[PDB]
Structure 1
Amino acid sequence: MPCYSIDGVIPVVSPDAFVHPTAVLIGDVIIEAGVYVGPFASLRADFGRIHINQNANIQDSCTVHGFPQSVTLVEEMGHIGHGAILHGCRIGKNVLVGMNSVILDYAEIGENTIIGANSLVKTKDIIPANVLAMGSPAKVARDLSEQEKKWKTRGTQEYMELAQRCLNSMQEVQPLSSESDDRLTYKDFSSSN
Structure 2
Amino acid sequence: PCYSIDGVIPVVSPDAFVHPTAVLIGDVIIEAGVYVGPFASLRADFGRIHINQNANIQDSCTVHGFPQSVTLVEEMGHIGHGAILHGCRIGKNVLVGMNSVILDYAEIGENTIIGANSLVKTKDIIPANVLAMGSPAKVARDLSEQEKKWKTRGTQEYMELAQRCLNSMQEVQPLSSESDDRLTYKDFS
User: For the superposition of Structure 1 and Structure 2, which TM-score range results when normalised by the shorter chain?
Assistant: over 0.9
Distance 1:105 1:88 in 2: 4
Q: Cα distance, 1:96 vs. partner? A: 0.0
1:145 aligns to what? 144
What per-residue deviation string (whole Å, max 9, x for no partner) do you get for residues 28-77 of structure 1?
00000000000000000000000000000000000000000000000000
Partner of 2:111: 112
Deviation at 1:13, TM superposition (A): 0.1
Task: Give the SS at the match of 2:45.
Answer: strand
Q: Once the 2 structures are TM-superposed, how far is the Cα of residue 122 of structure 1 from its aligned partner?
A: 0.1
Aligned equivalents of 1:78, 1:151: Cα separation in 2: 14
Alignment of 1:61-76 (within 5 A): 61-76=60-75
Distance in 1 (alpha carbons) for counterparts of 2:80 and 2:124: 20
| Displaced runs of 4 or more, over 3 A | none
- In the aligned structure 1, how far is the partner of 2:176 from the partner of 2:160? 29
1:175 is paired with a residue of what secondary structure?
Answer: coil
Shift of 1:117: 0.2
Q: Deviations over 1:132-171 (max 9, x none)?
A: 0000000111000000000000000000000000000000
Matched length: 189
TM-score calculated relative to the size of structure 2: 0.99
Structure 2 SS opposite 1:165 = helix
Any stretches of 5+ residues in structure 1 without a counterpart?
none
Give CA deviations for 1:66-115 in whole Å, capped at 9, x if unaligned. 00000000000000000000000000000000000000000000000000
Partners of 1:30 and 1:20 lie apart in 2 by 15
Q: Distance in 2 between matches of 1:117 and 1:13?
A: 28
Q: Which runs of 5+ in 2 are unaligned?
A: none
Corresponding position of 1:103: 102
Alpha-carbon distance between aligned partners in 1 of 2:186 and 2:114, rounded to the nearest angstrom: 31
Partner Cα separation in structure 2 for residue 137 and residue 107 of structure 1: 12
CA RMSD, aligned part only?
0.6
How high is the sequence identity, in percent, across the aligned residues?
99
Matched position secondary structure for 1:142: strand
Q: TM-score, normalised by structure 1?
A: 0.97
Q: CA deviation at 1:19?
A: 0.1
